[PDB]
């Protein structure tokens, strides 16, 4: 039960990354390709707890 | 894999699996290592599907 919002880049290598990303350090956010052309295993389910 | 990141900056490092940093936490037994040379304009279509 801990929401975490952060736009900072996460380093995944020996080099320290501050504003450069793409090869060794990645951006921690990926989007959904929510299209109606899929079947059932990729549709957006509106989940409330 | 700590001696892997000292062979010049890369061009594409997108992956469809586990992280390179967590490779040390899981112990393996069989990995394929094959290499070739293609023109730099033809790297983009090396992708699953």
């Amino acid at each position, epitope marked *: 039960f801990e929401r975490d919002i952060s*736009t900072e*880049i996460y380093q995944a290598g020996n080099k320290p990354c*501050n*504003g*450069v*990303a*793409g*090869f060794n350090c990645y*951006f921690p*956010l990926r*989007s959904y390709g929510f299209r109606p052309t899929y079947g059932v295993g990729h549709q957006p389910y509106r989940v409330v707890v | 894999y700590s001696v892997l990141y000292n062979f010049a*900056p890369f*061009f*594409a490092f997108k992956c469809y699996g586990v992280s390179p940093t967590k490779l040390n936490d899981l112990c393996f037994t069989n990995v394929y290592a094959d290499s070739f040379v293609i023109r*730099g*304009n*033809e790297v*983009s279509q090396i992708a699953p599907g």
Partner: antibody
Amino acid sequence: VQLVQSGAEVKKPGASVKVSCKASGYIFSDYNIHWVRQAPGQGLEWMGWISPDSDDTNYAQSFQGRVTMTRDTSITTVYMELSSLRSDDTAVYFCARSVGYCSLNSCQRWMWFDTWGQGALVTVSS
Amino acid sequence: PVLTQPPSASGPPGQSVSISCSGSRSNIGTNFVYWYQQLPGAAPKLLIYKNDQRPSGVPERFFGSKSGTSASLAISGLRSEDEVDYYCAAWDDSLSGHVFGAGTKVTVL
């Protein structure tokens, strides 16, 4: 799809000018629009984005109070107006549609202007 | 803010000439870079999306990439369609909106 839009002509400064964008072919409920301007012999500049299915809106950090927006979903159009026009605003205006859908601030990264609307040069003189 | 590009760059046909596009910490490097070309007296169109790929109808002739806080584009063959200008585009957080380049002109020799 085709993105015909109606331009304007030479006009007195400080008046109100109406420019409209028409959407055809594709369904006009799922794609954002973006507004850009191009001065002659100059790089492009960004205005903001407006959702078609909502009153969603957002503007740039320099052009805030001189711009409003109007939607006509029944006519399947969007309406764009300029108030307090300047001398160095004689720029061609593009009704740019971006692929996908974004309303959040952090959503704008994956957005490229898939298609553009042909523009007409709007001028201001007396 | 704006992105610094050379106003012009030219090369003879049959070989490859490149265009540079510098960027700051927030302008590029933490984000994705897109490129647009425009025919003179016409509407601009997409050239490279998602920093590597091209849309349908754009051939394999076009290529562009970035390494650090700057991006580069490569063309090969200047016959009838590469005399147009090119633009470098990205997204940042200081202006909270799309920031575009100045403009690059490519001719033939």
